[PDB]
């Protein structure tokens, strides 16, 4: 295909390996998730802008929009842990094993 496509998809899988290997913090994983979505948005916008698809130009930003509509939910899924545990370490999140 090209070169910047390779760079963007490699950034996506780099951020995927960042998310799929935790480092004892939930919000850092949320940041990696938003990075994966950044790579997705950048790839989609570049693909459209190369292919002159005008009417599909709504799809990137709306994609972006919906990501925030879940990302805040992840933040809303953080303080509740902070309302039960003192911190937000994932190794403390092992109550569901019995």
């Amino acid at each position: 295909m090209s070169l910047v496509y390779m760079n963007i998809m490699m950034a996506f899988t780099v951020s995927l390996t960042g998310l799929l290997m935790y480092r004892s913090h939930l919000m850092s994983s949320l940041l990696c998730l938003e990075g994966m979505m950044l790579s997705l948005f950048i790839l989609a916008t570049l693909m459209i802008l190369n292919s002159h698809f005008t009417l599909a130009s709504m799809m990137p930003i709306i994609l972006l929009v919906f990501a925030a509509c879940e990302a805040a939910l992840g933040l809303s899924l953080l303080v509740m842990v902070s309302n039960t545990y003192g911190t937000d370490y994932v190794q403390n999140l092992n109550l569901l094993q019995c």
Binding site: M1, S51, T54
Partner: protein
């Protein structure tokens, strides 16, 4: 269970965007409008398996229109040959390619 209610109620929800060769605002064509038109009209209603087995040439031409990768290989080959011929030293660029050319208008 693909409940296609878009045809049952006759309401257009997302058929106006799903294809690159659709109706566009202010009538702007995409970069592969003709190839999309050929690939749709050749592979309409005959089934996906027969479309893949028979309409492969126009789909290949459309994919070459979109990705342009064979043209990239062509440009890479001629540019590597050009760099090599400059590097040994049996090629001189013309004044038209070098910049002092006085373009058409």
């Amino acid at each position: 269970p693909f409940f296609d209610v878009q045809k049952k109620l006759g309401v257009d929800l997302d058929h106006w965007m799903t294809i690159q060769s659709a109706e566009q605002p202010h009538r702007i064509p995409a970069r592969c409008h003709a190839f999309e038109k050929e690939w749709i009209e050749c592979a309409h209603g005959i089934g996906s398996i027969r479309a893949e087995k028979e309409c492969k040439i126009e789909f290949e031409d459309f994919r070459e229109c979109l990705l342009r990768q064979k043209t990239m290989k062509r440009l890479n080959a001629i540019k590597r040959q050009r760099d090599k011929l400059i590097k040994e030293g049996k090629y001189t660029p013309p004044p038209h390619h070098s910049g002092q050319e006085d373009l058409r208008p």
